[PDB]
């Protein structure tokens, strides 16, 4: 349908659609054979050797183009067979384009965009511009002249440099002033680029290895999109470029990227243009369209043709979508324009085409070409209109397999890149130097690219304007409005001169970047660490692979980032029936060295990213995981972007005295325009993050993918150096294929990348969320603050007019402006990988915290990256076993002060907010404590703010708005109680607040007290948070606190419970107080099913047994406490059998021994398991006398199935089988300790307390009982 004829190059000229034609030219040119494939479109199967007369030869120029790939073949397209093929290829690709909805539609838009007329020195007349036509030589020798939208030519010298070109003018900028001009696309369908992907691995697992081929239909689309902008005269000025910093050692020596090009690629590249600049352009071309409307309007005459003025006026109406009235006058409708322009600029885009063809394509212009390939799409066995390369019902139909240059190699011939590998380079040295290819360096966009008007204040009226993202659905609603006929006519025009004089539109100006350029640096950089991984490439037999560079200085210069284990293994020295081998075993190490994985925002960390690239920042050595937790994604970045959110311009509202309606209208406008404003700022930050951060991460991502490739090649090579010294013989006797060894390691490498991608995805979002967005959210909250005052002052001053609605509105205003407009990445980004990363990032409330204190690598740090500073008092004490546990004593140097960053805090942050922590409050011992409320967490500036405080049997939360008065919520517990859930045991506190409602205090996930705070405040938000015993009048007192958190919202019930389970550390067992259960440490035992009893032994040895006897004492201090005695019975010590753990913590599923102290002598707790029946009575046996008796115990903290539990001790026989959990038999007699499998069968069917429910109780100063 799109091209109605087949053509053959040999078909004879006919004057109509096969003709020798002439073109605009500087001086004289000779005619060339062209074929009119469609109304207004011609093809000239001929190398372009005449549009640019300052390129004579088709040879590589003396000084090389600054492009990563280039290809010269001065004999290409020199014969007729080639010319025929070309014609056929180009036809095929138009058919491929026109067969897609978006294609059918671009091309209709192209045929429709006749270049304007244009010429006319006279205001009143319309004349054709000559450069927008060709002269068509007829069979008889005469010539007709013909208008022309677009022409495809063969390419110039650099075959793969595909361009849109036009002929210019003395004065008019035809491609930028709405007029448009004929477009000449230099193109070939006989070649294509190679690029690499490392992203589809996460959707497409068994995928490729090497390069992939750009589908040439996409390349031709790219060019037609350009042609589209230039035919409607809306191309962006080429002086308008995305300027890059260039002076730093790591920065790309140089790189032109024009805004026109960014626009044309679309997808995430189009998002580098900020809203301000985007709007500037839309307004500019809107006004250029107006000037065309007003040119048409003055037109009373029309020369050089037999068509009517009206007819021609009507062609341009349809092109520009003008509105005509009854009087014949024309005008541009802002709405119809906005849509047209959107379509041309935001819909017609390369990224959108990729969606329609379903091809793999570079994803951003920054993903550079790496190769060039000869192809041949004409035969259907190679390439169809419908599938391109990826042919249905074949091996090629699957994972973009058709475009994999390895798999479909019968279809892509590798060609020479005429750009040297170090043609363009910087030279990095260390105070050894290495040339580094310019296209391997970082993109650093200058801050000048990023402009906004966020600082400008705005006046809101009742008039004020209320606005008003590109899915496939939206594209469909455009398609459905199209009119797919009334094609613009071919019309007679009067002969131009036989030689049409014209010069190509003159472009800049632009300059050879200085070529490297030495840099003396102090550290080895990641490029050095990357060059070390390379070799050599090479022959004999070197490749002594090793760590610690200088490797560099060989070869074998061959650095690796595993582990002599590996360097040693594959630097032998191995043959030959032990090849095989060796081989088997290296396929293993690789997939354990590379699939290797290991904080709650960056879940998955790959710890060899450090070593491979030396990250980066890169001073070491390789606990890159340590440094990552300590500092967050910022250690990856090569440069730290600046986040420059200015004080936002505020709104002032216009009053409409005595006017109810305009006064409410103006409120509504104020609020909606606010909603716009968050959007504006969010959008700004995302744009910033995309250009400066997410690009650094994607480079690193590719560099990893390469590092892996580097290692698998070095390994493959060292194998063959061996297998070759051989057989050989047999040799013909272990018929092994590197081609299947390759297959095995790529599967491996892809698996690694699924992890690495994921890890780096999370690094990207986490930086966005915790180091960029917050700076915005603060300026946004001050903006609200100030809008709220204004709006309430407005509602107050016009209360006369608003008699019936002063509440409804104040409530509307207070409800609206008290609530954060949530950030949704999907609003700003189209890209499902980042979107799903972000959804998972949000899923965890902790990532949203504004303070997240944790002990990591030897300091207490804020993991949310909001604390400006954390001052730790000299006499604070961190539990040597779990340094997250912090002891603060009643000394003034036992304090910790946290200070939030000024640029991130706002006055209203404690209006809906929450805090959680765990605390261990020792028992109160002394009477002075009976009436002594003391502070322990204090956030108060001159009387206002919040604090957490303690008194006898109480935890107190207190808010004080704004210079008095208070509100207060309280949790109360008794010290006259047998066994307390609370006294001296770790408890989980959460305080939530909602200014318009009430504060709530929760304890271990349970709501205790809530109380209205709607009578306040406001609260003065303090910079400081002091952790300190303040006012405690017991000299000897202290508290333990840990896992402090602060949140900027009010947590619901469910959130609070999840948070409780997440911080419970359920992989680890705990003693009675809540501290980690430890090895080699005495514990008194409390059975939870009979807690008024304790353990004893009637007799040592197999004759004796252990039993529960009662009662336990009491312990008391008159008027202060009365509790069951807990330091009773025979003590238990848990001993190591199996381990790992360098450490002393008893973990879930550890296999242990249980010793039992009797009279200061330890015995082994054991039993005869073949004793008849389910219950096996336990005994205390002499340590060296256990014989083959059952003694190994599996410590448990959860069941299965995951439900946590208090049944700690599953005893096992010496074959590995369950005997039973340890509990007690009775109700019979005599409360012996037994192991019973009955217990194992209950725990799976219920979580109730059972006879096997134990708690271990160590001595603790906070309990104070005296043994």
């Amino acid at each position: 349908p799109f091209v109605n004829k087949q053509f053959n190059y040999k078909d004879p000229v006919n004057g109509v659609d096969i003709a020798y034609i002439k073109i605009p030219n500087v001086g004289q040119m000779q005619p060339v054979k062209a074929f009119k494939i469609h109304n207004k479109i011609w093809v000239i199967p001929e190398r372009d050797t005449f549009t640019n007369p300052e390129e004579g030869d088709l040879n590589p120029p003396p000084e090389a183009k600054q492009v990563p790939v280039s290809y010269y073949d001065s004999t290409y397209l020199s014969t007729d067979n080639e010319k025929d093929n070309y014609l056929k290829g180009v036809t095929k690709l138009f058919e491929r384009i026109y067969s897609t909805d978006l294609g059918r539609m671009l091309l209709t838009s192209i045929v429709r965009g006749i270049p304007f007329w244009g010429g006319s020195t006279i205001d009143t007349e319309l004349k054709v511009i000559d450069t927008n036509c060709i002269n068509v030589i007829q069979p008889d020798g005469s010539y007709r002249s013909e208008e022309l939208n677009l022409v495809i030519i063969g390419p110039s010298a650099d075959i793969i440099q595909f361009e849109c070109k036009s002929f210019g003018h003395e004065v008019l900028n035809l491609t930028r002033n709405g007029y448009g001009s004929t477009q000449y696309i230099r193109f070939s369908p006989d070649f294509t680029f190679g690029f690499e992907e490392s992203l589809e691995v996460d959707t497409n697992p068994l995928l490729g290895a090497g390069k992939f081929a750009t589908d040439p239909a996409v390349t031709l689309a790219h060019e037609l999109i350009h042609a589209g902008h230039r035919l409607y005269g809306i191309a962006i000025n080429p002086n308008r470029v995305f300027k890059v910093n260039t002076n730093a050692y790591y920065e790309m020596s140089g790189l032109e990227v024009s805004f026109e090009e960014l626009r044309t690629f679309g997808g995430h590249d189009a998002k580098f243009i900020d809203s301000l600049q985007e709007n500037e352009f839309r307004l500019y071309y809107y006004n250029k369209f107006k000037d065309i409307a007003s040119t048409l309007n003055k037109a009373k005459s029309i020369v050089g043709t037999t068509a009517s003025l009206q007819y021609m006026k009507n062609v341009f109406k349809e092109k520009y979508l003008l509105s005509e009235d009854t009087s014949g006058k024309f005008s541009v409708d802002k709405l119809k324009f906005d849509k047209l322009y959107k379509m041309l600029t935001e819909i017609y885009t390369e990224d959108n085409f990729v969606k329609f063809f379903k091809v793999l394509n570079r994803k951003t212009y920054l993903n550079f070409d790496k190769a060039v390939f000869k192809i041949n799409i004409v035969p259907k066995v190679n390439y169809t209109i419908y599938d391109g390369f990826n042919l249905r019902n074949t091996n090629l139909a699957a994972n973009f397999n058709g475009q994999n240059t390895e798999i479909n190699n019968m279809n892509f011939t590798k060609l020479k890149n005429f750009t040297g590998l170090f043609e363009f380079y910087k030279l990095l040295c260390v105070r050894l130097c290495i040339k580094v290819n310019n296209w391997d360096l970082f993109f650093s966009p200058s801050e000048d690219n990023f402009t906004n008007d966020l600082n400008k204040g705005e006046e809101i009226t009742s008039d004020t304007n209320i606005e008003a993202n590109i899915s496939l659905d939206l594209i469909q609603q455009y398609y459905l409005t199209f009119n797919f006929d009334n094609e613009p006519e071919n019309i007679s025009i009067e002969n131009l001169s036989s030689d049409i004089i014209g010069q190509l539109e003159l472009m800049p100006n632009i300059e050879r970047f200085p070529n490297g350029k030495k840099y003396e640096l102090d550290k080895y950089t990641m490029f050095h660490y990357l060059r070390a991984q390379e070799f050599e490439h090479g022959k004999s037999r070197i490749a002594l692979t090793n760590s610690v560079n200088e490797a560099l200085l060989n070869p074998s210069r061959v650095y690796t980032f595993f582990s002599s284990d590996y360097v040693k293994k594959v630097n032998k020295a191995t043959e030959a029936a032990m090849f095989l081998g060796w081989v088997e075993q290296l396929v293993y190490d690789f997939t354990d060295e590379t699939s290797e994985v290991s904080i709650a925002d960056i879940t998955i960390i790959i710890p060899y990213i450090g070593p491979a690239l030396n990250i980066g920042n890169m001073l070491y050595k390789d606990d890159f995981v340590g440094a990552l937790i300590f500092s967050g994604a910022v250690i990856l970045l090569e440069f730290i972007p600046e986040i420059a959110i200015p004080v936002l311009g505020t709104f002032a509202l216009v009053s409409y005295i005595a006017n109810k309606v305009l006064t409410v209208q103006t409120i509504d406008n104020a609020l909606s325009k606010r909603n716009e404003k968050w959007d504006e700022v969010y959008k700004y930050i995302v744009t910033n993050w995309l250009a400066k951060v997410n690009t650094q991460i994607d480079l690193i991502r590719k560099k990893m993918k390469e590092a892996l490739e580097n290692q698998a090649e070095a390994t493959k090579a060292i194998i063959n150096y061996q297998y070759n010294q051989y057989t050989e013989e047999e040799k013909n006797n272990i018929n092994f294929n590197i081609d299947d060894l390759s297959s095995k390691l790529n599967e491996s490498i892809n698996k690694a990348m699924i992890n690495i991608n994921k890890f780096l995805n999370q690094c990207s979002v986490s930086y966005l969320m915790n180091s960029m967005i917050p700076y915005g959210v603060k300026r946004l909250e001050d903006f609200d603050a100030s809008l709220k005052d204004a709006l309430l002052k407005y509602i107050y001053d016009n209360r006369g007019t608003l008699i019936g609605q002063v509440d409804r509105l104040k409530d509307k205003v207070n409800n609206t402006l008290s609530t954060d407009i949530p950030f949704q990445l999907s609003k700003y980004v189209d890209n499902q990988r980042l979107l799903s990363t972000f959804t998972e990032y949000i899923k965890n409330i902790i990532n949203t915290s504004i303070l997240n204190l944790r002990y990591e690598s030897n300091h207490l740090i804020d993991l949310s990256r909001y604390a400006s500073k954390i001052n730790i008092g000299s006499k604070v004490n961190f539990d040597p076993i779990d340094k997250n546990q912090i002891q603060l004593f009643n000394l003034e140097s036992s304090k910790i002060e946290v200070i939030l960053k000024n640029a991130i805090v706002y006055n209203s942050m404690y209006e809906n907010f929450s805090t959680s922590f765990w605390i261990r409050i020792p028992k109160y011992f002394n009477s002075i404590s009976l009436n002594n409320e003391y502070t322990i967490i204090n956030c108060m500036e001159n009387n206002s703010g919040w604090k957490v405080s303690l008194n006898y049997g109480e935890i107190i939360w207190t808010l004080q708005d704004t210079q008095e008065i208070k509100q207060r919520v309280v949790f109360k517990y008794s010290q006259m109680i047998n066994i307390s859930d609370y006294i001296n045991r770790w408890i989980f506190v959460t305080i939530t607040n909602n200014r318009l409602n009430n504060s709530k205090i929760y304890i271990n996930g349970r709501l205790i007290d809530q109380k209205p705070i709607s009578n306040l405040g406001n609260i003065h938000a303090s910079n400081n948070i002091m952790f300190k015993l303040d006012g405690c009048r017991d000299t000897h007192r202290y508290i333990w606190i840990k896992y402090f958190n602060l949140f900027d919202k009010e947590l619901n019930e469910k959130e609070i419970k999840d948070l409780y389970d997440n911080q419970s550390n359920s992989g680890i067992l705990k003693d009675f107080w809540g501290d980690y259960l430890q090895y080699d440490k005495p514990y008194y035992m409390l059975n939870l099913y009979d807690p008024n009893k304790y353990v004893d032994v009637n007799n040592v040895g197999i004759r004796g047994y252990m039993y529960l006897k009662g009662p336990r004492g009491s312990v008391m201090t008159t008027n202060i406490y009365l509790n069951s005695s807990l330091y009773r019975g025979t003590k238990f010590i848990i001993k190591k059998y199996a381990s790992g753990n360098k450490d002393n913590i008893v973990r879930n599923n550890d296999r242990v021994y249980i010793n039992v102290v009797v009279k200061n002598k330890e015995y082994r707790l054991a039993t005869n398991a073949s004793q008849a029946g389910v219950e096996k009575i336990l005994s205390a046996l002499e340590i060296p006398d256990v014989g083959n008796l059952s003694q190994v115990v599996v410590m448990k903290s959860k069941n299965d199935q995951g439900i946590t539990n208090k049944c700690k001790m599953n005893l096992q026989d010496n074959n590995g089988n369950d005997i039973g959990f340890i509990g007690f038999h009775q109700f019979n007699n005599i409360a012996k300790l037994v192991a019973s499998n009955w217990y194992n069968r209950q725990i799976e069917r219920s979580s109730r307390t059972l006879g096997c429910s134990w708690e271990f109780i160590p001595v603790d100063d906070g309990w104070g009982e005296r043994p």
């Epitope: 000299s874 006499k875 004593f889 000394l891 003034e892 140097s893 020792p922 011992f925 002394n926 009477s927 002075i928 006012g1031 009048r1033 017991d1034 000299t1035 000897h1036 007192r1037 201090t1117 008159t1118 001595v1259 603790d1260 100063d1261 906070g1262 309990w1263 104070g1264 009982e1265 005296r1266």
Partner: antibody, heavy 117, light 112 residues
Framework: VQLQESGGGLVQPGGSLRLSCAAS????????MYWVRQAPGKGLEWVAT????????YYSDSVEGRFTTSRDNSKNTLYLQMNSLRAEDTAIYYC???????????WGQGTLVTVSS | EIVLTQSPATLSLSPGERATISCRAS??????????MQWYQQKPGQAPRLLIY???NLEPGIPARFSGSGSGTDFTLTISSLEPEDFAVYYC?????????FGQGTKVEIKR
Amino acid sequence: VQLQESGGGLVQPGGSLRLSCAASGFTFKYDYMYWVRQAPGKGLEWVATISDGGSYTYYSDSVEGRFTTSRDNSKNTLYLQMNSLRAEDTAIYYCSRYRYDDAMDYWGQGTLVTVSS
Amino acid sequence: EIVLTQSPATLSLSPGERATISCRASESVDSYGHSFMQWYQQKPGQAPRLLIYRASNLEPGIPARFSGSGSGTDFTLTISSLEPEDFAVYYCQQGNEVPFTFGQGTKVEIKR
């Protein structure tokens, strides 16, 4: 490592006086400091304690409202402002360091306060 | 106010004999697993000297003949084998809570 306490002397009933214990040779600014007194040929009596930062003070009920203890961590010095003195305040006055969390381990020589017309 | 009754009030004993002075609290003197009873020795014209702290801990620099014991409300300082250098007034002192308080004194006189 010693404490020299000065300020002692004769003073009229109802009058006033200020003692100054001068610490050297150890980390004053971290230690609670106590004032203790002993009327001639009689028992030891605790007067007052002051926390390391100087923010929290304790007084024996006999001298409450009437004596004030302060400190200056920068000049390693401890102070006892002493007002509306009575006959029964006649005593030798000792400052001592409290070694947390044990006992008062270092003491000065004392200084004699005599209250009489 | 915790009152510490110390006895015997006077004690006269030959060198090399055992001295057992005994202190008794009106209320308990224990908290946080400790008993904050201290024992001091004062000689005429000298500041009191720490002997024993938290009930049972000998102060470094003080010789072994001094031991301390007890808990709760009843504490005891014994001098294992007296010297003539030990004529002093010995004081118990609580540190458990404010008001921190002293015993009334016990006068070891030496016999010859």
